[PDB]
Design a protein around this ligand. Structure first.
Ligand SMILES: CN1CCc2nc(C(=O)N[C@@H]3CCCC[C@@H]3NC(=O)c3cc4cc(Cl)ccc4[nH]3)sc2C1
Ligand SMILES: [Ca+2]
Ligand SMILES: [Ca+2]
Lengths: 233, 54
């Protein structure tokens, strides 16, 4: 995250971190249930073997709450394609169940029509992660969050060098220097509705971070709710 | 003219669906609908979608 704020105690509890063999974070994820993590499929080519960390807020120091979980099953969308990053969504099923506690808890899945109508028509949602603090920078050691406005679908297509499919949506700022960035990918985009938080997107890609007249591109979770329901069995 | 679910989410805490011409509320998984049929009540600890207090 470029800009934004730290998640303070208990504020971003559905955040997961995919960590490599070297044990460093390379992608985010969202906690759906005690066994299932949501992430971007593009993240699955970013390491040969990886585990999932939860409950972490500061990756330099151990405040007792963290736990690592091994992955038992990866379910990538059959149609993901590296070329356009269309269908950028994978579900992970953990070998052992997440124990919920302070800083560890799921985001809710909304219902498709309600979500499209009510959540994605709000002003903003919230994205969070441990990715880069600037385009050229290092990954954050502190978990961060940022409120990002939903962007008009037409504006977004005009803004983008690349094809924006029906499975994607734009969020972010035209000129303000605030954005998700590399390393935040796979992480949550959630929309708050009356005190309850719902998953609405997965951090997918952008053209650098926080560039003027550019936006962040999120996988449209509402297009995949049936699919996720299927993946969870 | 905003009616039913289009007027303040139909008084629903979470999901709202227009069925016949009435509002029917429901709730994410891990909540139940209260007696008033509008509010959603968490049926365990660590309900989805809440920031944690402990
Ligand atoms: C169709 N394509 C799919 C993937 C892609 N990555 C692009 C890109 O600029 N990637 C960056 C350069 C090196 C690889 C990872 C880098 N990722 C980012 O900087 C990035 C991802 C991302 C996601 C979001 Cl939501 C906001 C900002 C943002 N910045 S452009 C593009 C278009
Ligand atoms: Ca830590
Ligand atoms: Ca921008």
């Amino acid at each position: 995250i470029v800009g934004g704020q730290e998640c303070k105690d208990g504020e971003c509890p559905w955040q997961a971190l995919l960590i490599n063999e070297e044990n460093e974070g390379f992608c985010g994820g969202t906690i759906l249930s005690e066994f299932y993590i949501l992430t971007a499929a593009h993240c699955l080519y970013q390491a040969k073997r990886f585990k999932v960390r939860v409950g972490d807020r500061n990756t330099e120091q151990e405040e007792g709450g963290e736990a690592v979980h091994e992955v038992e099953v990866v379910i990538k969308h059959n149609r993901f394609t590296k070329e356009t990053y269309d269908f950028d969504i994978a579900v992970l099923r953990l070998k052992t169940p997440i124990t919920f506690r302070m800083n560890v808890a799921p985001a809710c899945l909304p219902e498709r029509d309600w979500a499209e109508s009510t959540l994605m028509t709000q002003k903003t949602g919230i994205v969070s992660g441990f990715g880069r603090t600037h385009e050229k920078g290092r990954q954050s050691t502190r978990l961060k969050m940022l409120e990002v406005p939903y962007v008009d679908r037409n504006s977004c297509k005009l803004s983008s060098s690349f094809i924006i499919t029906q499975n994607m949506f734009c969020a972010g700022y035209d000129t303000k220097q605030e954005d998700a960035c590399q390393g935040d990918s796979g992480g949550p985009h959630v929309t708050r509705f009356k005190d309850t938080y719902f998953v609405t997107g997965i951090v997918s890609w952008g053209e650098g971070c926080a560039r003027k007249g550019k936006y962040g591109i999120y996988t449209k979770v509402t297009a995949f709710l049936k699919w996720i329901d299927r993946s969870m069995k | 003219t905003r009616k039913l679910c289009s007027l303040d989410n139909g008084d629903c805490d979470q999901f709202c669906h227009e069925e016949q011409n009435s509002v029917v509320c429901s709730c994410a998984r891990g909540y139940t609908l209260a007696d008033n049929g509008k509010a959603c009540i968490p049926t365990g600890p660590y309900p989805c979608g809440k920031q944690t207090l402990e």
